[PDB]
Amino acid sequence: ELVNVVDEKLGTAYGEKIDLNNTNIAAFIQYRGLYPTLAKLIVKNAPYESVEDVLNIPGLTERQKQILRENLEHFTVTEVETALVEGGDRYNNGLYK
Amino acid sequence: QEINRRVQASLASGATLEEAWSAIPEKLAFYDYIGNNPAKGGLFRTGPMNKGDGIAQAWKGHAVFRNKEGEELFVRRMPAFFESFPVILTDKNGVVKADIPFRRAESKYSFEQQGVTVSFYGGELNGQTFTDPPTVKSYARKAIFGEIFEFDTETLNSDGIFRTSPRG
Amino acid sequence: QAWKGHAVFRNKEGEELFVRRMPAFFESFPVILTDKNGVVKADIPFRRAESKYSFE
Amino acid sequence: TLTYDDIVGTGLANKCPTLDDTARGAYPIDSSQTYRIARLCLQPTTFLVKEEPKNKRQEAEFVPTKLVTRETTSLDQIQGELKVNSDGSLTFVEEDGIDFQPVTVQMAGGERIPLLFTVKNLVASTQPNVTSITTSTDFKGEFNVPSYRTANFLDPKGRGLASGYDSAIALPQAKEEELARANVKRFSLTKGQISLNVAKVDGRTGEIAGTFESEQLSDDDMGAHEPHEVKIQGVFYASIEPA
Amino acid sequence: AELTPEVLTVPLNSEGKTITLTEKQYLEGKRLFQYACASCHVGGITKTNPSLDLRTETLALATPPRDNIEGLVDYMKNPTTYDGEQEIAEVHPSLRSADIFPKMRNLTEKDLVAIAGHILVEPKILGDKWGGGKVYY
Amino acid sequence: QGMFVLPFMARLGVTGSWSGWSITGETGIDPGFWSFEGVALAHIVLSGLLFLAACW
Ligand code: CLA
Ligand code: HEM
Ligand SMILES: CC1=C(/C=C/C(C)=C/C=C/C(C)=C\C=C\C=C(C)\C=C\C=C(C)\C=C\C2=C(C)CCCC2(C)C)C(C)(C)CCC1
Ligand SMILES: [Ca+2]
Ligand SMILES: [Ca+2]
Ligand SMILES: [Cl-]
């Protein structure tokens, strides 16, 4: 029984929040302070077992940790979907304006 | 409009939703289906309407769409002009609540996100509710055509493409 | 698509039985099984009421 | 030393560097030192595809094919860590580079077999106690083969995985079930295998060259049909460096 | 509809203070924006980086906030990334890089104020078209 | 497969196609010009030239 996996993923938390494991990087422009620096570190250090695990990225400043903490309510994680992360699509998903 | 008038008159007299819709004659629902619109054909699409969408077997009943909050959603109907048409659902005031997205990466209205559901009243599917996004989408795809019917596509090797009527 | 293999027929007693082949002449042909000496051992009967050689 | 203008349009840009016949030396591995491959290059010379078995269910053979996508085939500028393991074996961990090429080869009878020839996320290891890389060293490992098309790819009727229609809109009222494999796009991810056989070593410069053979699946057109089995053969080059 | 004083009233700073631009300031703003910025920001998007647009909410969520005259003028003097982390005058037009972006050399403080006012006022007129791209043309 | 002239071409040594297959089940053979396609083409061209001569 065949499933469209992106559509399926949209019914998970991926469709409601920024999925640190899957969401394209431009999504971090939605909230203050995440783009491009933290966004780059987050995508680079994925996947994550839990949202809070993002705080363990090496090299972070205290300011950065605090921003991450203020925006955790906006993050989620789901299983890595190959279709969303191959091809470097997390950095450029073929979508502009 | 006439179908809705009859259904409203049915609800007003105390009928349940299911009863109200089951009282709708199948013939009338069949007139409210774009496959019977004579402006949907093709010059070289030869033969009877049946060779296209198939021999109509039965009305499935009226498809009612709802989101996770339980607000009733309405599929935007395909105008005759369009050989193909997107799938768009709005609330009663025409505000967009759900769709079938083309690009997914920035989708905000997927049926999956909005938890769109469908329940059927009247016809073969009376009383049934489907919540799995693939099936609800399928019925939405059919709902752009209006009332949804079961077809025999096997008997005539129907090809699935609308043909015009003797009127056309 | 593929060969199914060589069919070998046996009765309850275990004697190998051999299907009588259709000659080119016959558009249709009965199903008759004989032992190695050509003695009839089994068939698909037409009339059943007095069948004595049915596969069953 | 050749410039771009010397190379452009000759075909040489698709060739891996070679080492001459005197290069049969040995490159010492200091097990206390960390190492990198600064450039790994793979130039395929033959593409073989396993014919689909007639139904006899004997051993289906790999048959030759003709390359039609021209000299666009080599993997190059690949780099990564070369770990020294506790048993003295070496493991290459691919990090990055131009580690894939789309390739179409054409079978006897005209059938075209597109594939994603790749060593993406390669993990290849040697035999134990490799105190030096010599013409006797070999690397063996596996890699990832992602879908030949990525998620945005739209088929000719506009259907796709991460974008596109989710139905056959030209057949608005056909029964969906028979068309499901085509309507519903799926993203493949399978494993490939590669052997690197060192044939040449310059002990002084850290360059090694040899032959390779890889095995992987071809394109499945986002799940519409069964992929073919492919075996790729060619030459390779790597420059080892302390890092 | 008219270009009223109210349309032309935009946030001066983050502290609730506003400025009402004159019609002549708005026209100057349009003109200078076309002259120095539109090559990349035509219609409020960004051609060399479409992820970032000039919509007011987007500007509001930038660091420091840019949904005001002060923020934009400063951006035009000392541009940063959206999070404020690195200064990008070297690859983006500014007074500070007026040497490498020569169109910025004759731009005065008054001009920067006019441009800022165009950027904030235009979405008040054009709505979703501003920063909308081709979808909204 | 209901092949009629094909067996006559094969019979006299035309066994391969330009497309790479052979009727003996080989792959990656180069039959040269005289593949089945080449025979067909030669016959077509011959046909045309005979047409012109007939006209003359
Ligand atoms: C008023 C005329 C008329 C009409 C409206 C119909 C309408 C109907 N016919 Mg009937 N039909 C007609 C005459 C007509 N027919 C005639 C005279 C015959 C005898 C040959 C038939 C035989 C017939 C059969 C056998 C069948 C129908 C069927 C049907 C239906 C299928 C229509 C079809 O597929 O169209 C197809 C129409 C076209 C593809 C358009 C043709 C356009 C032509 C080829 C253009 C020619 C261009 C010209 C050469 C240009 C010259 C240029 C020069 C001046 C320079 C349809 C309801 C079918 C049906 O379903 O019945 C149950 C059915 O099976 N019809
Ligand atoms: C006077 C001229 C210009 C002004 C005032 C201007 C204005 C702005 C503003 C306010 C931003 C911040 C976007 C945001 O925070 O949402 C921005 C971003 C950006 N603009 Fe300009 N624009 C101008 C011209 C140009 C030109 C000519 C280019 C390119 C050649 C350009 C390229 C960019 C880029 C690349 C960004 C985002 C860079 C980053 O954040 O890392 N702009 N612009
Ligand atoms: C040897 C060789 C070959 C053989 C060849 C052949 C077989 C060929 C033949 C030949 C031929 C077969 C030729 C062709 C011909 C003739 C011509 C050269 C043409 C012509 C005519 C004309 C000139 C005419 C004109 C006109 C017409 C068109 C019309 C009307 C008028 C007129 C009459 C005037 C082969 C292959 C085996 C191989 C090797 C060897
Ligand atoms: Ca069919
Ligand atoms: Ca060796
Ligand atoms: Cl946006």
From Swiss-Prot, chain A:
Q: According to Swiss-Prot or TrEMBL, what is its membrane topology?
A: Peripheral membrane protein
Tell me the GO BP annotations in alphabetical order: photosynthesis; photosystem II stabilization
| Any single Gene Ontology cellular-component annotation | photosystem II oxygen evolving complex
Keywords (A to Z) from UniProt: Electron transport, Membrane, Photosynthesis, Photosystem II, Signal, Thylakoid, Transport
Provide the cofactor note recorded for this chain's UniProt entry. PSII binds multiple chlorophylls, carotenoids and specific lipids.
Subcellular compartments: Cellular thylakoid membrane
Where is it chiefly localized? membrane
Assembly and binders: PSII is composed of 1 copy each of membrane proteins PsbA, PsbB, PsbC, PsbD, PsbE, PsbF, PsbH, PsbI, PsbJ, PsbK, PsbL, PsbM, PsbT, PsbX, PsbY, PsbZ, Psb30/Ycf12, peripheral proteins PsbO, CyanoQ (PsbQ), PsbU, PsbV and a large number of cofactors. It forms dimeric complexes.
Question: What the protein does?
Answer: One of the extrinsic, lumenal subunits of photosystem II (PSII). PSII is a light-driven water plastoquinone oxidoreductase, using light energy to abstract electrons from H(2)O, generating a proton gradient subsequently used for ATP formation. The extrinsic proteins stabilize the structure of photosystem II oxygen-evolving complex (OEC), the ion environment of oxygen evolution and protect the OEC against heat-induced inactivation.
Query: Which family does the record claim for this protein?
Result: Belongs to the PsbU family.
Protein's name according to its UniProt entry: Photosystem II extrinsic protein U
Q: Which gene is annotated as encoding this protein in its UniProt record?
A: psbU
**What stretch of the whole protein does this chain cover?**
38 to 134 of 134
Curated annotation (Swiss-Prot), chain B:
Question: Where does it live in the cell?
Answer: Cellular thylakoid membrane
Family, as annotated: Belongs to the PsbB/PsbC family. PsbB subfamily.
Protein name as it appears in the record: Photosystem II CP47 reaction center protein
Task: Output the superkingdom of the source species.
Answer: Bacteria
What does the function comment of this entry state? One of the components of the core complex of photosystem II (PSII). It binds chlorophyll and helps catalyze the primary light-induced photochemical processes of PSII. PSII is a light-driven water:plastoquinone oxidoreductase, using light energy to abstract electrons from H(2)O, generating O(2) and a proton gradient subsequently used for ATP formation.
Q: Which organism is it from?
A: Thermosynechococcus vestitus (strain NIES-2133 / IAM M-273 / BP-1)
| Subunit | PSII is composed of 1 copy each of membrane proteins PsbA, PsbB, PsbC, PsbD, PsbE, PsbF, PsbH, PsbI, PsbJ, PsbK, PsbL, PsbM, PsbT, PsbX, PsbY, PsbZ, Psb30/Ycf12, peripheral proteins PsbO, CyanoQ (PsbQ), PsbU, PsbV and a large number of cofactors. It forms dimeric complexes. Part of a photosystem II (PSII) assembly intermediate complex PSII-I; crystallized from a strain deleted of psbJ, it forms monomeric PSII before addition of the oxygen evolving complex. PSII-I includes 3 assembly factors not found in mature PSII (Psb27, Psb28 and Psb34).
Per the record, what ranges lie on the membrane's Lumenal side?
1-168
UniProtKB/Swiss-Prot annotation, chain D:
Q: List, alphabetically, the GO terms of the cellular component aspect.
A: photosystem II oxygen evolving complex; plasma membrane-derived thylakoid membrane
UniProt cross-references to InterPro entries, sorted A to Z: OMP/PagP_b-brl, PsbO
Cellular compartments annotated = Cellular thylakoid membrane
Return the SUPFAM superfamilies for the record.
Answer: OMPA-like
- The main location is membrane
Q: Does the keyword Signal apply?
A: yes
Q: Which UniProt keywords apply?
A: Membrane, Photosynthesis, Photosystem II, Signal, Thylakoid
Molecular functions (GO terms): oxygen evolving activity
One GO term under biological process is: photosystem II assembly
Q: Its membrane topology, per UniProt?
A: Peripheral membrane protein
Cofactor detail note: PSII binds multiple chlorophylls, carotenoids and specific lipids.
- Pfam families from the xrefs? MSP (PF01716)
Superkingdom of this entry's organism? Bacteria
What role does it play? One of the extrinsic, lumenal subunits of photosystem II (PSII), which stabilize and protect the oxygen-evolving complex. PSII is a light-driven water plastoquinone oxidoreductase, using light energy to abstract electrons from H(2)O, generating a proton gradient subsequently used for ATP formation. Required for dimerization of PSII and for binding of PsbQ to PSII.
Q: What does the record note on quaternary structure? A: PSII is composed of 1 copy each of membrane proteins PsbA, PsbB, PsbC, PsbD, PsbE, PsbF, PsbH, PsbI, PsbJ, PsbK, PsbL, PsbM, PsbT, PsbX, PsbY, PsbZ, Psb30/Ycf12, peripheral proteins PsbO, CyanoQ (PsbQ), PsbU, PsbV and a large number of cofactors. It forms dimeric complexes.
So what family is this one in?
Belongs to the PsbO family.
Q: What PANTHER family does this protein map onto? A: OXYGEN-EVOLVING ENHANCER PROTEIN 1-2, CHLOROPLASTIC
The protein depicted here goes by the name Photosystem II extrinsic protein O
Give the organism the record lists.
Thermosynechococcus vestitus (strain NIES-2133 / IAM M-273 / BP-1)
> Which gene carries the instructions for this protein?
psbO
UniProtKB/Swiss-Prot annotation, chain E:
Changes seen on gene knockout: Cells do not grow photoautotrophically under low CO(2) concentrations.
Cofactors needed by this protein, per the record, are: heme c
Q: How is the cofactor bound?
A: Binds 1 heme c group covalently per subunit. PSII binds multiple chlorophylls, carotenoids and specific lipids.
The cellular location(s) given in this protein's UniProt record come to:
Cellular thylakoid membrane
What's any GO biological process attached to this entry? photosynthesis, light reaction
- GO CC aspect terms: photosystem II; plasma membrane-derived thylakoid membrane
The keyword Electron transport appears for this protein:
yes
Q: Which UniProt keywords apply?
A: Electron transport, Heme, Iron, Membrane, Metal-binding, Photosynthesis, Photosystem II, Signal, Thylakoid, Transport
Q: Where does heme c bind?
A: H41, H92
Report the membrane topology from the UniProt record. Peripheral membrane protein
Among the GO molecular function terms of this UniProt record, one is: electron transfer activity
Record's function text: One of the extrinsic, lumenal subunits of photosystem II (PSII). PSII is a light-driven water plastoquinone oxidoreductase, using light energy to abstract electrons from H(2)O, generating a proton gradient subsequently used for ATP formation. The extrinsic proteins stabilize the structure of photosystem II oxygen-evolving complex (OEC), the ion environment of oxygen evolution and protect the OEC against heat-induced inactivation. Low-potential cytochrome c that plays a role in the OEC of PSII.
**Which family does the entry's similarity section mention?**
Belongs to the cytochrome c family. PsbV subfamily.
What name does this protein carry?
Photosystem II extrinsic protein V
Q: Which organism is it from?
A: Thermosynechococcus vestitus (strain NIES-2133 / IAM M-273 / BP-1)
> Where the shown chain sits in the full protein?
27 to 163 of 163
